[PDB]
Design an enzyme around this catalytic site. Structure first.
Site, short mmCIF file in Angstrom:
data_model
loop_
_atom_site.label_atom_id
_atom_site.label_comp_id
_atom_site.label_asym_id
_atom_site.label_seq_id
_atom_site.Cartn_x
_atom_site.Cartn_y
_atom_site.Cartn_z
N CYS A 1 -68.92 -0.84 -6.53
CA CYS A 1 -67.66 -0.65 -5.78
C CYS A 1 -66.88 0.47 -6.40
O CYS A 1 -66.26 1.32 -5.69
CB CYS A 1 -66.90 -1.96 -5.71
SG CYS A 1 -67.80 -3.18 -4.77
N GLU B 1 -60.72 -5.67 -0.04
CA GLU B 1 -60.65 -4.87 -1.27
C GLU B 1 -61.12 -3.42 -0.96
O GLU B 1 -61.84 -3.16 0.05
CB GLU B 1 -61.56 -5.48 -2.32
CG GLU B 1 -63.05 -5.34 -1.97
CD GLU B 1 -64.00 -6.21 -2.82
OE1 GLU B 1 -64.49 -7.25 -2.31
OE2 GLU B 1 -64.30 -5.86 -4.01
#
Ligand code: B12
Ligand code: B12
Lengths: 543, 542
Positions: free
Chosen positions: B328, B294
């Site tokens: 993130c 990711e």
């Protein structure tokens, strides 16, 4: 509007017709055979729904078992044709993606019923004539497998759509399966009319648009496939067919920042080439291109001392010689216990000798010719390399003749030692190598197979003994991707033998399960909170 | 043997402890904070079960909010260490992959219960100290999310094992979900102790062995995760921990023919770089390496005229300043209808000015410091850029000071024109940009967000009006992965907000659904035919 949570029809495998003498489907097939053979046509590009010959080189598509007989003529896509194909896909995108899933899916359910009834023998015939398939090979491919891909993909998609999350208290979480941004490039092989139909339509179902470059020798069936989809209501520009060698189409497609992905088939080296291209050029693309495909391979069969001889014999003949050994993989290596070879060795060879390859419009033939001159040359070279190799006898076959069609006879090589895998992957054709081993060395032969098998898609053990079967299932667990007990190792039936691939492959997202369809979507989660916090302070912070 | 078709326990999300004053957990937490703070340790490699410092450079791990205070010292893995981690993963493979699924699963279910109970405040405290998380930020990550990954991955894996095909007449078809051949290389970021634990354990669940390279500033909690796993019974060599910067470890892993995959986080350029390497060199690998990951990004919120002002204010504060903006992704850009800004603008600025960042051992702080000096410089540069630029005013905050910790204050920028995405992605930190737009230009603003957003993982609409909500869900459909209505857009809870990713990414196989576990298996179909043909001839041939 619609207020419903609808179901799709429940798929089942389409039955295979036999085309036995006197049968009605056989009469219908001959009508279709003569009609395609006697009335060759232009095989145009189909772009934004318009069928047009282009300005590139004209290339004939012929019957491989009778190569003086033309089925049609295509023009090799130019850069301009490919740029038009792409612009058409991007232009149809918006209206296609806005159709509800149920209406996109009707296109392919309809296409399937059309292929099951009124188009059935036309598509079979076209596949027989262009690709040199016997009627049975055309029927399991161009009819049944293609029908099943469409009906099962619709069901797989619908099941993906109801995979939803848990909603906790005070919220509602949902998932939206978005189509991709940009166009998908489907490149399809000669071997299966079914793969040629499926690689472009699968992404289309999920709301994407597509450019589709079929193999030249499959283009008769591909074009007809395109007409079928149009008759089913596929809208203009949703899929755009470009004929030819694909060189100009890849220049264009891979340079366009809108390339969302590539659905194809190829070798490990082809995959690595594409990975390298996309990785190097990643900053040129709006989206990360998705590279989804499968490879070919060559397969093996191991017979234990408990093997049934007639089962073994028949599995080798079909596994190696069905479709002239031109499926995505075929049986190239058999390892047969000595005592079982004494019982069925001679019968294998005699039957291989009698096995008739010829014009597939004669339905008494078992099979036809190889697909083209290049394939023929590769086979001839592999035969000559065997005639002069130490290890190997040509026990039967090895004859060839390209004067009328690209004909190569069924050939059994006897190797004194375990046959080396590297030799058998240099061609696709009806060449079977057999290595006879001492019964008591079963376990050692399994290790030899394991150690020298990097290229098998499938394998089989023939054995009535349960320990023997289980020992093969353990020891060859990683030596092949689909494994067969007491039958020929071969092409999966849709829904029945999904997955597989050769040792170490990463291709479980290929056609045949829902995972393929997922690659053509991009899921987002949506969360709604009903009564969110109105103060940012957290309980731990209190004095 | 065993004769059964077993079920695993049913996972539910782990409850979040509040650590309120006088709560038992708060007392236990202070105990664990002191123990780790006051007793710094060697942070060794863990290879084949053996905990060893290596010969590489010594690197201290400190409290980022009190950087004079060391927590431990690790050794930068050398090539030899990396080669040894790989051989250990390869030696352990055979016995690990031969354990039944249930026995492998039980290791992670047991670790899940250990983390829920006896190891809970210890792992949280390690995360607070090393990564500079408030207790709540440690609790939802190091404890809850990590527990949830383990319990939910076990259920996902078990659900995959029962996906089986149709058997037609005369046959039996089955599917065998094999582990990969060769080792998996897990590389994990500073931001989450959960990700750091999950990336290496997820493939291991499925029968694989692993080398794990954690981020330096997360190594305290990583090493303690490794110990928790050993105490749950993880066998030696199944996961092998190598500390440091990764350079040598990547040299060895990428050169080894047995590399089966890499489970990581990174940017598009990082994926591209790995794709280019693996493709160019594919002939050297026994298997096609699987690259599973990711990316980060930066997020936005848009407030319609119908937005609840206090909901928006709170969502903006939490979304941008929770964990100092270092998830993130974090909220970097807010697009606010003029009439709503009249109502909560002053309150936003005032609350951000009062927001306390400090030593996270003081539980009254909202948050701590940035993770390291590199991060701190990037923020400083972004604040000075903003000050210099004509487009932008500093409405509150902008102060910074690295003399005791890597501290940067919550900062709000006012941009007269829609804030440009390229600016917000060059740092991670507590910098929120607000653009105030005229109420009647809602659809225009949604278009500007769409056109101008390529790096949002998440987005949110604050609006009570249903058309406004629905217009946002359609028009921003592709502008962000996960999308939020009347709440802050942030990291998923496991099983609740799977998938997402930034525009045009291809990461639905990332952690949080069964798709990730499939990446660590190679399924094969097995077919047995009971009465196969004994003649090869076909009916069409008569
Ligand atoms: C990769 C590649 C190869 C590889 C393929 C396998 C591998 N990766 O190891 C290899 C090295 C074997 C190859 C060989 C050659 N190819 Co080359 N290659 C390509 C390339 C860069 C991309 C192809 C691709 O992967 N497409 C994606 C896949 C999924 O689609 P595909 O349709 O299955 O592609 C297959 C065909 O393209 C076939 N193929 C590749 N090259 C050639 C050349 C000819 C004449 C033929 C008939 C087929 C063919 O190989 C692919 C894999 O099966 C293209 C560029 C392009 N614009 O297409 C050229 C290109 C097709 N190659 C070309 C050339 C000249 C060659 C060679 C003559 C010399 C050489 N060694 O490069 C030989 C001929 C091979 C033959 N079959 O007769 C030219 C052809 C020009 C023309 N005739 O119009 C191209 C267009 C490059 C160029 N512009 O100079 N090639
Ligand atoms: C790709 C790459 C880069 C890329 C990364 C992003 C991108 N793709 O655009 C870029 C161009 C930005 C880069 C920059 C530099 N890097 Co560099 N690079 C790498 C490489 C080839 C692979 C890293 C990777 O992708 N790993 C896989 C990912 C998934 O793991 P990861 O742990 O998250 O990787 C991160 C770090 O490696 C970081 N990074 C990359 N390089 C450097 C260098 C330093 C000093 C630091 C602290 C961090 C860092 O970026 C990666 C992605 O976030 C390595 C080779 C190696 N053996 O690691 C070098 C390597 C680490 N880089 C190095 C160097 C010299 C540089 C530069 C000083 C000079 C330069 N431009 O080449 C700068 C320093 C940047 C900094 N942060 O201080 C050396 C370090 C030697 C040493 N100190 O022991 C290496 C070992 C070899 C090389 N140069 O080819 N690098």
């Amino acid at each position: 509007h619609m207020d419903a949570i609808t179901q799709v029809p429940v798929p089942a495998n389409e039955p295979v017709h036999d085309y036995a003498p006197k049968s009605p489907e056989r009469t219908r097939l001959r009508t279709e055979l003569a009609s395609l053979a006697d009335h060759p046509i232009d095989l145009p590009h189909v772009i934004g729904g318009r069928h047009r010959m282009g300005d590139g080189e004209r290339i004939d598509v012929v019957q491989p078992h009778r190569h003086a007989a033309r089925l049609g003529t295509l023009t090799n896509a130019t850069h301009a044709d490919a740029a038009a194909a792409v612009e058409a896909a991007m232009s149809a995108k918006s209206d296609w993606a806005a159709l509800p899933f149920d209406e996109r899916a009707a296109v392919f359910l309809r296409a399937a019923d059309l292929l099951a009834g009124p188009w059935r023998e036309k598509i079979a015939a076209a596949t027989m004539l262009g690709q040199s398939k016997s009627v049975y090979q055309a029927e399991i491919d161009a009819v049944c497998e293609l029908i099943d891909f469409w009906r099962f993909n619709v069901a797989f998609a619908r099941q993906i759509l109801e995979q939803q999350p848990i909603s906790g208290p005070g919220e509602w979480n949902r998932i939206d399966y978005r189509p991709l941004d940009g166009f998908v490039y489907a490149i399809t092989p000669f071997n299966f009319t079914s793969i040629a139909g499926n690689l472009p339509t699968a992404p289309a179902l999920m709301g994407n648009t597509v450019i589709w470059k079929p193999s030249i020798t499959q283009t008769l069936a591909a074009y007809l496939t395109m007409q079928l989809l149009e008759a089913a209501g596929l809208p203009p520009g949703v899929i755009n067919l470009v004929t030819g060698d694909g060189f100009a189409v890849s220049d264009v497609a891979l340079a366009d920042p809108r390339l969302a992905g590539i659905h194809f088939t190829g070798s490990t080296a082809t995959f690595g080439h594409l990975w390298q291209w996309v990785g190097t050029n990643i900053g040129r693309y709006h989206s990360y291109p998705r590279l989804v495909g499968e490879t070919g391979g060559k397969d093996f069969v191991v017979a234990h001392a408990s093997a049934r001889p007639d089962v073994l014999r028949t599995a080798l003949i079909r596994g190696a010689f069905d479709y002239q050994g031109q499926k995505c993989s075929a049986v190239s290596r058999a390892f047969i216990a000595h005592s079982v070879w004494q019982r069925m060795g001679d019968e294998l060879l005699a039957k291989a000798a009698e096995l008739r390859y010829g014009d597939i419009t004669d339905l008494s033939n078992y099979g036809g010719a190889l697909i083209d001159q290049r394939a023929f040359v590769k086979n001839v070279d592999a035969i000559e390399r065997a005639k002069g190799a130490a290890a190997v006898t040509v026990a039967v076959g090895g004859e060839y003749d390209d004067s009328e069609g690209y004909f190569v006879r069924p050939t059994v090589l006897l190797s004194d030692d375990p046959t080396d895998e590297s030799f058998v992957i240099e061609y696709f054709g009806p060449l079977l190598s057999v290595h006879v081993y001492p019964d008591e060395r079963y376990e050692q032969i399994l290790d030899v197979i394991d150690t020298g098998s990097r290229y098998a898609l499938t394998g089989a053990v023939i054995a009535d003994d349960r320990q023997a079967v289980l020992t093969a299932l353990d020891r060859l667990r990683f030596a092949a991707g689909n494994f067969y007990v007491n039958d020929k190792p071969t092409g999966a039936v849709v829904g029945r033998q999904p997955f597989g691939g050769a040792r170490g492959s990463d291709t479980n997202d290929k056609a045949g399960s829902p995972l393929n369809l997922l690659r053509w979507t991009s899921a987002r989660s949506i969360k709604e909170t009903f009564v969110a916090a109105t103060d940012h302070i957290y309980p731990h912070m209190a004095v």
